[PDB]
Symmetry: C4
């Protein structure tokens, strides 16, 4: 489905947002 496509794209996209939040927390605590 192009339905699974779109959901797969959002999923990736939140996953990069989560990795960035964690990277940010890691940076901040390292200071």
């Amino acid at each position: 489905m192009k339905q699974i496509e779109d959901k797969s794209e959002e999923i990736l996209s939140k996953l990069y947002h989560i990795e960035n939040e964690l990277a940010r927390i890691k940076k901040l605590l390292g200071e």
Copy 2:
């Protein structure tokens, strides 16, 4: 194809839940 898509929706829901958890953690950390 439908169990897969049902699965994707489920996966996205858990990401939202992880985002709520990170929202709380960020507040606790003074960030």
Copy 3:
């Protein structure tokens, strides 16, 4: 595919592991 099935199951499974790690961090910082 029963291939997408298995990957979908592991994906969920790491997602519950991540939610539990974060829950744990949230608990610990709340103390």
Copy 4:
């Protein structure tokens, strides 16, 4: 079906990356 599966593998890889980030965060937090 193959782009979806290629997608799943990608998604799992990002979860592993989030787990490495949480491993580091946990060490920083004294946990």
